[PDB]
Amino acid sequence: RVIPVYQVNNLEEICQLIIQAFEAGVDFQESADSFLLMLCLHHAYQGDYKLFLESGAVKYLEGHGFRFEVKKRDGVKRLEELLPAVSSGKNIKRTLAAMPEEETTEANAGQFLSFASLFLPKLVVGEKACLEKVQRQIQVHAEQGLIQYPTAWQSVGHMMVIFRLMRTNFLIKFLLIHQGMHMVAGHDANDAVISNSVAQARFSGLLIVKTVLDHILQKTERGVRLHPLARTAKVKNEVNSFKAALSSLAKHGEYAPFARLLNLSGVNNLEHGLFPQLSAIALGVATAHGSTLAGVNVGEQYQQLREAATEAEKQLQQYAESRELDHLGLDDQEKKILMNFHQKKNE
Amino acid sequence: RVIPVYQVNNLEEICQLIIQAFEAGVDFQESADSFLLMLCLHHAYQGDYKLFLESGAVKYLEGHGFRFEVKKRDGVKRLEELLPAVSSGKNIKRTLAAMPEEETTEANAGQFLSFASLFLPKLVVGEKACLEKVQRQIQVHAEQGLIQYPTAWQSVGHMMVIFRLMRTNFLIKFLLIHQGMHMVAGHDANDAVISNSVAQARFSGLLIVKTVLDHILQKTERGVRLHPLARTAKVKNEVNSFKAALSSLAKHGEYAPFARLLNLSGVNNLEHGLFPQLSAIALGVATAHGSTLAGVNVGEQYQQLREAATEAEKQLQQYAESRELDHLGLDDQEKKILMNFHQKKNEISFQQTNAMVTLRKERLAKLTEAITA
Amino acid sequence: RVIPVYQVNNLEEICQLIIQAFEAGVDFQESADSFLLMLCLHHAYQGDYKLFLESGAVKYLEGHGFRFEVKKRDGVKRLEELLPAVSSGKNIKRTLAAMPEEETTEANAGQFLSFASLFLPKLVVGEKACLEKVQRQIQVHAEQGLIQYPTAWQSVGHMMVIFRLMRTNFLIKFLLIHQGMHMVAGHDANDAVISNSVAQARFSGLLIVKTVLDHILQKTERGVRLHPLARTAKVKNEVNSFKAALSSLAKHGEYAPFARLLNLSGVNNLEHGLFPQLSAIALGVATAHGSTLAGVNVGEQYQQLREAATEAEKQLQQYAESRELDHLGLDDQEKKILMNFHQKKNEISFQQTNAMVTLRKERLAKLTEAITA
Amino acid sequence: SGLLIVKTVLDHILQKTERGVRLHPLARTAKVKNEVNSFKAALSSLAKHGEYAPFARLLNLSGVNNLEHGLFPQLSAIALGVATAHGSTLAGVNVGEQYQQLREAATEAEKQLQQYAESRELDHLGLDDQEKKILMNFHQKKNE
């Protein structure tokens, strides 16, 4: 509801020792909410309170109502001046005492925020996918050599420090992508992971629906309309229900590629169990378009649908360009080439 | 019954004090009768008493019982010598003295009649959606860039009087619509709004009725005849009564698009509940013909007859325009194309993108979110 | 109704004070009626009262009800003896005395009418895109190198008056367009802009309507007849009403390209929503004929009829001009070439470079980036 | 560098016209319509960055993220065949074996285009018709 923000003098000593506590791996419930605000304030906003104040992301969740208040700290020598309300935080002040408040290692905010951004696309998906991807995202950003982290940060237990953290703190996650997709002109190798991670994280878990977005919705002035297979009354009650949830969906607006991390109402109003034939339509059409959706996520009831949804759509791809290319400008022998070429490419 | 006509000069003074009445918002059902008739005289009839007198619609008016009688007046300082009431005419003078008898406005008789003409094509709808359409036509005629209004005429209780005021007078509706269709208009920006208003007032609240003659009666080169759904007996006694309602309707000449407002006998027989089968039938036709009407509803027993006849008409649209092909002068290349063109009209497919359609419906629902809020 | 004509000499003094009015920006709907009529008299009619009087369009004007009456005037110091209003004519004099009655400009009556002629071919569009087209025609006639304007005429609120001013007067549009087509023009650089304006004002906002007669009516050596899409009954009652709209349209003679501006009866029946099927049909034709119109949209139920009839017309373009070959006098070498020429017209191929096309679209999108910003 | 996949598609698919570049003859197939319209839009965003498009994969602005061969999984497979058909010799095959059937024939019918073109083209050019039959043989002998 209400989330306090802090006012410090030295960013870097305070911000890194926060990370040292996450290098210690101690948990926080409302404390890390105010803490990670200073990290983008250090990295993306350079300590500028006004630039943080004029941020549209701040206006976005105060548009949801998540308001703020400044806390002036000038005795910056610790993290134990950042708890004005306790409410469970007696353990928090002990864990701050349990970690070295005065012994520092190598860190930076954007170094950690890029490290924080690693866990984004597979958080809501699954830890095993978060295990496979991020370790390969360690590989890919090492194959480019874009940024290098300590191997202590490569600890799978240290992954659990963040994986539990990012599942709780959503407030921080919108700030990364507001830095990511909205105000993108930067050149930080930290942010270069982050902005690429935004592209990595689009429609994650909504990808089932986003495939149905690709194939069924057919854009018209009076709203999108049906696919030719979606004109079958078999799925009429589905696609009208699918219309209504989608009508609710972009009320949340631009951040629909990140709704499964936003997790508002339409996310609950959208599951493949709610649309058990539609993805099975879409998954076949995906391979028929060569769209290559990962994983089959339905029962074997729908595989018979999932088979032919490739097939007749390929028969649509048969019937279309057999009719289409006749009007286009070429030789008719080149047509018979391209008739053969379209036959040879599918054997 | 008989409403007195006022013979008086300095009508430019007179019409401004009539503007001084309804800007103050004083309401009359007796004195404002003859007052607004002067606005037709000064603006539309240009002050000519004879042109007012020689109007055949006034002869159509006095031929029914609404007669006139000349009043010589010369005391132009106030509208209080102009009162046809003796009983409540004292109560009229109490309201007139409260508002200033000594002011003029930057509006003429022409603006305020055209301002009243705004209220015409939605009178049977209600207070709100008429004034909403007025609030449309304030900005619609702004898109026309035509004659603009005082912000004192943007007042609610100002305009609420006028919708009530046009609910009162049978006559001042009937002459103002006669200004539209009969003489050619648009020569004045006031009269153009009137000419816009009359064209919008054609069959207001009556497109239920008006499309039936368009659709049940079948226009051919020998008259009007039965529709294929009209040829059944399943509706029969509705339609013959409706033609009897039409026979009561068409006897009045050109004012059949106004008989809803201009209360006559046949419009009482003209009710959607009185023809509950037919109302969805032409609705099923015109939607299949693309001429569909918004905001109209179907009887709960009657949703049966809407959807199938809609398809059946499209089957007639499949039948007739295909039967049109071998009928008229053409050839085999032309026909086979127009068969395909008949099927090209029958789009059963769009082809879209994938990744733009992501952002499209993202914008399109955002477009819907911007239109609604 | 009747607008007074002013018999007065020293019109060179008169027209400059009319320029002094609208450069100051004072607005009238009563006094500026007869004022701009003098500009036709002094510039176009060369001061000749009889040539003004003997004009058949004025006889077409006075034949409808807009009559004239001669006013002897000799007090040329100011336009304040020239006022046809007695009621608000005092409020006219308050606006006239505020601006200087004692200045002249380097513009004549001829420039300002032609400056007003700029506002003509986009009047039904709106304030902006007309004035944008005016801001085009400022530089377009600069590319012509023709008559140039004061920078005081480049003022916005100066020009905003005039678009509102031409929204007012039915008459001063009607005479200024009569100067274009009827007498031969271009002899004066003022009248050439007028001659440019009238040619652009042909069917302004009406190429929806105008192309339909071009495309639905089929021009042959025995009249105009049905298009192959017009031969179906699927649209039928639109087109017969449209010819009835055309019968209401063509009765006015030469002013049918101006009936949108010059408000008449048929243009009320002339609406794209009133013919929603046909509007995409000729759009599908003319785009297939390459005569496509920009900025025009399709009904949401109507995108079906656009694309297939577009192909179907090209199939007719495949059919007819191939049927043209064996029809007319030619031979086998000629035909086989023109078959190939029919296919040479049907480019289904470009061949480009590789490494220049790199820099080409690098420049071409940079060209697009330079055009847009 | 790294845009060379796209730069090959730049070479073969974009066909320069006044109203923007247009399709290749194989790109007129509606198979890739949703691809090439999407490929149009990213390319429309691309030269907003301007002259340094040969170095965008080292610039790494937005269109670099908006351009991968995974986004265009048939288009390079079209282009790679046409590359060898033009002899353009692109290094490496960077798609799945789904596309090799496309990557095969994209050489083939384009060579059939190279068959059909100069068999029609050279007829109007200025030479002896025996020299034509030489060059007909020469174009046949050069491909065996």
Short mmCIF file of all heavy atoms in Angstrom, two decimals, chain C residues 248-263:
data_model
loop_
_atom_site.label_atom_id
_atom_site.label_comp_id
_atom_site.label_asym_id
_atom_site.label_seq_id
_atom_site.Cartn_x
_atom_site.Cartn_y
_atom_site.Cartn_z
N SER C 248 -31.86 14.67 -58.89
CA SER C 248 -31.91 15.90 -58.11
C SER C 248 -30.63 16.70 -58.26
O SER C 248 -30.63 17.91 -58.06
CB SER C 248 -32.15 15.57 -56.64
OG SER C 248 -31.01 14.91 -56.12
N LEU C 249 -29.53 16.03 -58.61
CA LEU C 249 -28.26 16.72 -58.71
C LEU C 249 -28.13 17.44 -60.04
O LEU C 249 -27.84 18.64 -60.09
CB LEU C 249 -27.12 15.72 -58.53
CG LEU C 249 -25.70 16.24 -58.43
CD1 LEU C 249 -25.57 17.11 -57.19
CD2 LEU C 249 -24.74 15.07 -58.36
N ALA C 250 -28.39 16.73 -61.14
CA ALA C 250 -28.07 17.25 -62.47
C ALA C 250 -29.08 18.29 -62.95
O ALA C 250 -28.92 18.86 -64.03
CB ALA C 250 -27.97 16.10 -63.47
N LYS C 251 -30.13 18.53 -62.16
CA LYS C 251 -31.12 19.52 -62.55
C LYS C 251 -30.60 20.94 -62.38
O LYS C 251 -31.19 21.89 -62.92
CB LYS C 251 -32.40 19.34 -61.75
CG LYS C 251 -32.26 19.71 -60.29
CD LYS C 251 -33.58 19.51 -59.57
CE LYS C 251 -33.51 19.96 -58.12
NZ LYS C 251 -32.63 19.08 -57.30
N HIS C 252 -29.51 21.11 -61.64
CA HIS C 252 -29.01 22.45 -61.35
C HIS C 252 -28.01 22.93 -62.39
O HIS C 252 -27.45 24.02 -62.23
CB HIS C 252 -28.36 22.46 -59.98
CG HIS C 252 -29.29 22.10 -58.88
ND1 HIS C 252 -30.27 22.95 -58.43
CD2 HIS C 252 -29.39 20.97 -58.14
CE1 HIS C 252 -30.94 22.36 -57.45
NE2 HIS C 252 -30.42 21.16 -57.25
N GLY C 253 -27.76 22.15 -63.43
CA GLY C 253 -26.82 22.57 -64.45
C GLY C 253 -25.38 22.38 -64.05
O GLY C 253 -24.99 21.31 -63.56
N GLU C 254 -24.57 23.42 -64.22
CA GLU C 254 -23.13 23.32 -64.11
C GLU C 254 -22.61 23.32 -62.68
O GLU C 254 -21.42 23.10 -62.47
CB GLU C 254 -22.46 24.46 -64.87
CG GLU C 254 -22.65 24.39 -66.37
CD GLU C 254 -22.01 25.57 -67.08
OE1 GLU C 254 -21.55 26.50 -66.38
OE2 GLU C 254 -21.97 25.56 -68.32
N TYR C 255 -23.46 23.60 -61.69
CA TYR C 255 -22.99 23.80 -60.33
C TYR C 255 -22.97 22.53 -59.51
O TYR C 255 -22.76 22.60 -58.29
CB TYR C 255 -23.85 24.86 -59.65
CG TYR C 255 -23.79 26.18 -60.37
CD1 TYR C 255 -24.83 26.60 -61.18
CD2 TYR C 255 -22.68 27.01 -60.24
CE1 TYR C 255 -24.78 27.81 -61.84
CE2 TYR C 255 -22.62 28.22 -60.90
CZ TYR C 255 -23.67 28.62 -61.70
OH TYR C 255 -23.60 29.82 -62.35
N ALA C 256 -23.23 21.38 -60.13
CA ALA C 256 -23.08 20.08 -59.48
C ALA C 256 -21.71 19.82 -58.84
O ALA C 256 -21.68 19.16 -57.79
CB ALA C 256 -23.42 18.97 -60.49
N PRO C 257 -20.57 20.31 -59.36
CA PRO C 257 -19.35 20.23 -58.54
C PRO C 257 -19.31 21.17 -57.35
O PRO C 257 -18.30 21.18 -56.64
CB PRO C 257 -18.23 20.55 -59.54
CG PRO C 257 -18.87 21.23 -60.64
CD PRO C 257 -20.20 20.61 -60.76
N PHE C 258 -20.36 21.95 -57.10
CA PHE C 258 -20.34 22.95 -56.05
C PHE C 258 -21.52 22.80 -55.10
O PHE C 258 -21.61 23.51 -54.10
CB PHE C 258 -20.32 24.33 -56.67
CG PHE C 258 -19.20 24.51 -57.63
CD1 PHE C 258 -19.43 24.49 -58.99
CD2 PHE C 258 -17.90 24.66 -57.16
CE1 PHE C 258 -18.39 24.65 -59.88
CE2 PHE C 258 -16.86 24.80 -58.04
CZ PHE C 258 -17.10 24.80 -59.40
N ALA C 259 -22.42 21.86 -55.40
CA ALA C 259 -23.61 21.60 -54.61
C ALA C 259 -23.31 21.17 -53.18
O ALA C 259 -24.14 21.39 -52.30
CB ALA C 259 -24.46 20.52 -55.29
N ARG C 260 -22.15 20.55 -52.94
CA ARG C 260 -21.64 20.38 -51.59
C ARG C 260 -21.44 21.71 -50.88
O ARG C 260 -21.90 21.85 -49.74
CB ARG C 260 -20.30 19.63 -51.62
CG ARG C 260 -19.60 19.52 -50.28
CD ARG C 260 -20.39 18.68 -49.31
NE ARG C 260 -20.51 17.30 -49.75
CZ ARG C 260 -21.35 16.42 -49.22
NH1 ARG C 260 -22.14 16.78 -48.22
NH2 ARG C 260 -21.41 15.18 -49.68
N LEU C 261 -20.80 22.67 -51.53
CA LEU C 261 -20.64 23.98 -50.91
C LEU C 261 -21.92 24.78 -51.03
O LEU C 261 -22.33 25.46 -50.08
CB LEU C 261 -19.49 24.72 -51.57
CG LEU C 261 -18.18 23.95 -51.46
CD1 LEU C 261 -17.06 24.72 -52.12
CD2 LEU C 261 -17.85 23.58 -50.02
N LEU C 262 -22.56 24.70 -52.17
CA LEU C 262 -23.72 25.52 -52.47
C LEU C 262 -24.92 24.65 -52.16
O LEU C 262 -25.38 23.89 -53.02
CB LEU C 262 -23.72 25.99 -53.93
CG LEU C 262 -22.85 27.19 -54.32
CD1 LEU C 262 -23.27 28.44 -53.55
CD2 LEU C 262 -21.34 26.96 -54.21
N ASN C 263 -25.41 24.77 -50.93
CA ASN C 263 -26.28 23.76 -50.33
C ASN C 263 -27.61 23.68 -51.06
O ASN C 263 -28.37 24.64 -51.14
CB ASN C 263 -26.50 24.08 -48.85
CG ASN C 263 -26.80 22.84 -48.02
OD1 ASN C 263 -26.73 22.88 -46.79
ND2 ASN C 263 -27.11 21.72 -48.67
#
